[PDB]
Write a protein that binds this ligand. Structure first.
Ligand SMILES: Cc1noc(C[C@H]2CCCN(c3ncnc4[nH]c5cc(F)ccc5c34)C2)n1
Length: 167
């Protein structure tokens, strides 16, 4: 038993809720919150800009030091950094950005990073401003992640759509 509430169960291990991941994170304090990161960890908008804003820019400061030391992430890759006031840890995962022409097949590789963590609060990777179809993202998620994932979907309309179309 864990502290996530109001989730609909899609599979043995995947759950989903219409929620703001920032507010979901500040209430739950999960062990891991996933950020929808880019390879530069520049948290300007979308989920990343919202998570970063909620940390009062501390996420960005930490991220800039990470990049200065290690260089950019790979598309499909990830790093574990602090969760600041939102979670114990933040798993920054780089899904492909369709609006940059990145290969959607890398979406499976991106979701594989979730398997290194027993429980995660996460957004749908490559959705929103990353330009992929969220219904496809949820499918890859279900078919790739084996650990327990709690998906927060900010938009009530898309959420209804993801549930109603789920196979
Ligand atoms: C790059 C990239 N690749 O995929 C994705 C998926 C995103 C897209 C935009 C919606 N995102 C969220 N998801 C859950 N909660 C949220 N609160 C938010 C608050 C905001 F001000 C903006 C966004 C979210 C949000 C998911 N972005």
């Amino acid at each position: 038993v864990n502290s996530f509430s109001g989730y609909l169960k899609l599979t043995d291990n995947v759950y989903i809720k219409n929620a703001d991941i920032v507010e979901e994170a500040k209430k739950v304090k999960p062990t891991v919150v996933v950020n929808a990161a880019n390879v530069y960890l520049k948290h300007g908008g979308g989920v990343a800009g919202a998570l970063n804003k909620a940390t009062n820019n501390a996420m960005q400061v930490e991220s800039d030091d990470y990049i200065a030391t290690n260089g950019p992430l790979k598309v499909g890759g990830s790093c574990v950094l602090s969760g600041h006031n939102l979670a114990k840890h933040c798993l920054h995962v780089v899904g492909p950005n369709v609006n940059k022409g990145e290969d959607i097949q890398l979406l499976k590789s991106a979701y594989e990073n979730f398997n290194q963590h027993e429980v995660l609060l996460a957004p749908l990777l490559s959705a929103g401003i990353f330009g992929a179809d969220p219904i496809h993202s949820l499918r890859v998620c279900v078919d790739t992640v084996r650990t327990n994932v709690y998906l927060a979907v900010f938009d009530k309309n898309l959420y209804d759509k993801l549930v109603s179309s789920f196979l």
